[PDB]
């Protein structure tokens, strides 16, 4: 469990390192990535190619919640969905602000969805053209379906950010996972501000006899 | 009136429906004309004249759908869960849960169809008398079409019966938040402790929606 595995792909990043829990999809992933990477890699990307697949090192079988955004930040993507080491990205700041109001943690310097017990943050498409949101949907299409399908065999709740972004994706996903498709952190009329999806997640988990998420674990001090 | 109508080739011959269902009715008419003959050769619960009476309900004012798999094996009225003389196990076990939730002690019956914001639903719209799921093959496409339409309006889908709905809920082409609970009429008494009804108002209020007043269902 503690040792990562590796497969070769034809183009950058040439090797994909991954946790055992992802084994069932890797052969397909390699096939699909070899099909599109040449086209994809002609653009500067967020994240860089060496970071495309680093989230495949995260275990899945101990996760109960996936928090999913459509693609990486248009700039400064780290390969960890939502992660902003300087805490400048609007999405993670708005998320932090909701969690602050939820948890009573008023003083903090950042927030990270990838250090919370039971939560896997996820970017549906694994790259975009640097500076251009959703620009690589055409390349990731089949890979993105493959990976999300795999994730939702493990998690109990899937929380998707952006109704236009995800209502179709969520609708067409055939899975027993419980879906919540909410407003995106930058929705007009400040709709995300009144959004209580993180609380809803915990209600659904507890209804299903599972432990709630401690969202305060995401804070950086 | 907000009421519309279409004709079909067999009984019930005409369907009157609220405007909110307009987008699915052309397709529904097409499907029903194919299968009506199978549904009419049998004695059915409910009778064909009652198959579609729920299509008279508006959908824009609904925020919860409470869904069972098909009508009662006998005495179906076309209103899901309804028992005019309060003699069906499902609606009696539902009333007892609502009684515990609301604290209403004395009552003579319960009806999910008289509650603001709730649409009670049967996934399949008939069964052969005395046999549950006996018309699933015939309703199949219509059932998918209608439930998908409902879930474009409601914010919570509450399905009763884990075996009945695990697969249907998984394949449902909707992003709606779905709760699949135990069946009220099961022998094993797990519905008695099921918190699904209680949690619906929790979910609605967290989603900035008005709660359901479940006590509206009681008949005195
Ligand atoms: Cl949105
Ligand atoms: Cl059940
Ligand atoms: K689902």
UniProtKB/Swiss-Prot annotation, chain B:
E.C. designation(s): 3.2.2.27
Membrane-spanning intervals of the chain: none
UniProt superkingdom: Viruses
Catalytic activity entry: Hydrolyzes single-stranded DNA or mismatched double-stranded DNA and polynucleotides, releasing free uracil
InterPro entries: Ura-DNA_Glyclase_AS, Uracil-DNA_glycosylase-like_sf
Keyword DNA damage: yes
GO BP annotations listed: DNA repair
Coiled coil: none
Keywords: DNA damage, DNA repair, DNA-binding, Hydrolase
Described purpose of this protein according to its UniProt entry: Plays an essential role in viral replication as a component of the DNA polymerase processivity factor. Excises uracil residues from the DNA which can arise as a result of misincorporation of dUMP residues by DNA polymerase or due to deamination of cytosine.
Oligomer status and interactors: Homodimer. Interacts with protein OPG148. Component of the Uracil-DNA glycosylase(UDG)-OPG148-polymerase complex; OPG148 and UDG form a heterodimeric processivity factor that associates with OPG71 to form the processive polymerase holoenzyme.
Protein's recorded name: Uracil-DNA glycosylase
Taxonomic classification: Viruses, Varidnaviria, Bamfordvirae, Nucleocytoviricota, Pokkesviricetes
